[PDB]
From Swiss-Prot:
Residue positions, PTM Phosphoserine: 27
Subcellular location: Cytoplasm; Nucleus, Nucleolus
Role this protein plays: Component of the ribosome, a large ribonucleoprotein complex responsible for the synthesis of proteins in the cell. The small ribosomal subunit (SSU) binds messenger RNAs (mRNAs) and translates the encoded message by selecting cognate aminoacyl-transfer RNA (tRNA) molecules. The large subunit (LSU) contains the ribosomal catalytic site termed the peptidyl transferase center (PTC), which catalyzes the formation of peptide bonds, thereby polymerizing the amino acids delivered by tRNAs into a polypeptide chain.
Highest taxon above the source species: Eukaryota
Complex formation: Component of the large ribosomal subunit (LSU). Part of the 5S RNP complex, which is a LSU subcomplex composed of the 5S RNA, RPL5 and RPL11. Component of a hexameric 5S RNP precursor complex, composed of 5S RNA, RRS1, RPF2/BXDC1, RPL5, RPL11 and HEATR3; this complex acts as a precursor for ribosome assembly. Interacts with isoform 1 of NVL in an ATP-dependent manner. Interacts with RRP1B. Interacts with IPO5, IPO7 and KPNB1; these interactions may be involved in RPL5 nuclear import for the assembly of ribosomal subunits.
Region annotated Disordered, chain positions: 8-48
Biased composition (Basic residues): 13-23
Gene label: RPL5
Name of the protein in its database record: Large ribosomal subunit protein uL18
Annotated family: Belongs to the universal ribosomal protein uL18 family.
RNA sequence: UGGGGGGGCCGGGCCACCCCUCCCACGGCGCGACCGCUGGGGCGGACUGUCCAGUGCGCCCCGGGCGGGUCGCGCCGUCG
């Protein structure tokens, strides 16, 4: 069978629904607000 | 006092006067359109924080602000 028909048949391209499965890279503003929030929470916990 | 010294002879254009009016260049002022950046709302969602709060992202809405580049227009100035 191989020697009588070697040509390849590509699988048809599927339409894409565009779902993201990973996690996007966090931004500078987000991480700076995160560190500010952590600092404030630590100060509040020290206050109590 | 024949010699010597002068005025000249007829048309055209231009700049000077006084006014109108083009196109172009340069500067200023103002108006308008096309572009960049920035504060609010809505929708969807992703995330963060040892109180329920907060932060980006994609779409739309934006009233807009700022600024310079292109084009159009009006006005002012040039022994242009």
């Amino acid at each position: 069978a191989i020697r009588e028909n070697p040509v390849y048949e590509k699988k048809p391209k599927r339409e894409v629904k565009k779902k993201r499965w990973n996690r996007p890279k966090m931004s500078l503003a987000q991480k700076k607000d995160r560190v500010a929030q952590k600092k404030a929470s630590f100060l509040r916990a020290q206050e109590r």
